[PDB]
């Protein structure tokens, strides 16, 4: 694991933080249900719920997600085994992992606690997220998707604001990606949602790849930039009513597949940012930009060179002390 860190191109602080997290993982052995003390709820969703817990043996603060599934015991054990790959998913742009176990009919996934929550929660407080902040967010998502592709040969499958986590150290990390094929299958038996970030090619059941995650990132970037889920697109009057001078689920899916993708409004955002999300939301995945092209896009090259105090902005927005 510490050798796999040298294969990553990190700055010195990113290497120190990963080495520190790997050290804390040594203080974690088997994970049992009776070893955790709840502190607070962090949020809930369709699949399950998340708690902030204290692992009494190690003393480490963790985020414990509980997914309720009615599955065969063999499928459950295979899910626990497939989740062990997360022990080797160590990157500045990937949420850390502590362990997974089963109890009370619930598969528990204990992971690194991100005291900034998800960008979904940050957006509800900020209203909109500035373009320069979204530049750092885009770089983190592209690099996280690149890490999963090169180091683990998997795609994310569920990129959206709620699965992009932040913390008081300014870090931006991906989570809830499809590391367990059995867990993806089991969660397909789900309740109907109210919105979607799924690419048009995955909705139609044709061939897909990380290009689908690029679409989801583009749709996520528009939502955080305008402060509203962008399907259907807003009116020109709604734009001035948001920057200054409801469809049901099937209708949204039909819109994603059969209607032009949303776009950022002109004027309030730079032309580089507008072109960036346009290349992310090209409906044909073969015409859509890929991870290599996005990293050398003019918007990313400018954002990468900018000095942005993201941790300070989080502190001033959600009240998260550094």
């Amino acid at each position: 694991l510490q050798k796999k860190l040298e294969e990553l191109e990190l700055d010195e602080q990113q290497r120190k933080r990963l080495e520190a997290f790997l050290t804390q993982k040594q203080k974690v052995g088997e994970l049992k249900d009776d070893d955790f003390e709840k502190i607070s709820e962090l949020g809930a969703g369709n699949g399950g719920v998340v708690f902030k817990v204290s692992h009494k043996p190690s003393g480490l603060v963790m985020a414990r997600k509980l997914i309720h599934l009615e599955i065969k015991p063999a499928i459950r054990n295979q899910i626990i085994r497939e989740l062990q790959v997360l022990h080797e998913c160590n990157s500045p742009y990937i949420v850390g992992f502590y362990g997974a176990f089963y109890s009370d009919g619930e598969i528990s996934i204990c992971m690194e606690h991100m005291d900034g929550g998800s960008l979904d929660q940050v957006l509800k407080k900020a209203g909109r997220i500035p373009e320069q902040i979204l530049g750092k967010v885009s770089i983190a998502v592209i690099k996280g998707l690149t890490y999963l592709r090169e180091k683990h040969k998997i795609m994310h499958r569920d990129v959206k604001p709620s699965n992009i986590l932040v913390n008081s150290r300014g870090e931006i990390k991906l989570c809830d990606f499809g590391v367990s094929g059995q867990l993806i299958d089991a969660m397909a038996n789900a309740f109907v949602g109210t919105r979607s970030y799924m690419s048009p090619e995955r909705l139609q059941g044709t061939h897909y790849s990380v290009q689908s995650d690029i679409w989801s990132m583009g749709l996520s970037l528009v939502e955080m930039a305008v402060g509203r889920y962008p399907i259907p697109p807003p009116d020109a009057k709604e734009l001035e009513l948001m920057f200054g001078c409801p469809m049901a689920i099937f209708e949204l899916l039909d819109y994603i597949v059969n209607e032009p993708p949303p776009k950022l409004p002109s004027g309030v955002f730079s032309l580089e940012f507008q072109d960036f999300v346009n290349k992310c939301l090209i409906k044909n995945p073969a015409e859509r930009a890929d991870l290599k092209q996005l990293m050398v896009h003019a918007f990313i090259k400018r954002s990468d060179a900018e000095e942005v105090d993201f941790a300070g902005w989080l502190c001033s927005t959600i009240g998260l002390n550094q």
Binding site: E70, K72, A190, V192, G193, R202, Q204, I249, L253, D254
Partner: protein, 260 residues
């Protein structure tokens, strides 16, 4: 309305699509579902009118509905396992005639509910229980006021009728939409699996089933499943809802093949 003082909430069982089930005591073993709904006053009256209908239901294949509390609903507690657990978790050893009998009793309870002008809205193996062995009990029927008003789909995708997915008209619920959901339960019984085992994307299922691009793979039905039962599964899950049979005809077809 039931007095909360007489309700002794014991253990927590789990949560579903519109509430959280607790075991309790109220003049006997009772099930209490803490509904996920601060309700609007217009909705509270629509709820009280539904409860008056559901409380009068009386059938051997239907779970008893007691009343409401203050929001929560009190139903008959069932100590058996759900059909979903028997088929997909425990993998209970069922004979073919036992699977047909489960299909028959489920059609009897549905025929009773529809003859009483009650749409289930959420028919699935999770809401079917096996009581004292092989006695079907249907639960979580009706409750449109607390499951949802907003004309948006609510419930499990796999059993949802295509016209209910689309929600093109404000009310896509009918006796035929329950028959589609019942047909998916038949698919569970006669395959031991869930539909669309090759699709691991919830949003893909919603879209393809809504457009008619995806339908249950009927080649996976058991080889010893009778041809009349195979046709019944195909008739219940017809994409066009006007082509689906109703439960009087469904029950007669099962009774015909059962008596050979």
């Amino acid at each position: 309305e039931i007095e909360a003082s007489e309700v002794m909430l014991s253990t927590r069982i789990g949560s579903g699509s519109f509430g959280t089930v607790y075991k309790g005591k109220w003049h006997g073993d009772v099930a209490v579902k803490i509904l996920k709904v601060d309700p609007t006053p217009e909705q509270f009256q629509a709820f009280r009118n539904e409860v008056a209908v559901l409380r009068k239901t009386r059938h051997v294949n239907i779970l008893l509905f007691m009343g409401y509390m203050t929001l929560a609903i009190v139903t008959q507690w069932c100590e058996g396992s759900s059909l979903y657990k028997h088929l997909h978790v425990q993998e209970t050893k069922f004979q073919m005639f036992q699977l047909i009998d489960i299909a028959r009793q489920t059609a009897q309870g549905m025929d009773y509910l529809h003859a009483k002008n009650i749409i289930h809205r959420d028919m699935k193996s999770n809401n079917i229980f096996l009581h004292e062995g092989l006695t079907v009990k249907i639960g979580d029927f009706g409750l449109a006021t607390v499951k949802s008003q907003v004309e948006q789909p609510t419930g499990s995708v796999l059993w949802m009728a295509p016209e209910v997915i689309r929600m093109q008209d404000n009310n896509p619920f009918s006796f035929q939409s329950d028959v589609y959901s019942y047909g998916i339960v038949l698919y569970e019984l006669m395959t031991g699996e869930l539909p669309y085992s090759h699709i691991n994307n919830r949003d893909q299922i919603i879209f393809m089933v809504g457009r008619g691009y995806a339908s249950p793979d009927l080649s996976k039905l058991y080889k010893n499943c009778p041809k009349a039962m195979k046709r019944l599964v195909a008739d219940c899950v017809k994409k066009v809802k006007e082509e689906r049979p109703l439960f009087p005809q469904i029950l007669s077809s099962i009774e015909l093949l059962q008596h050979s």
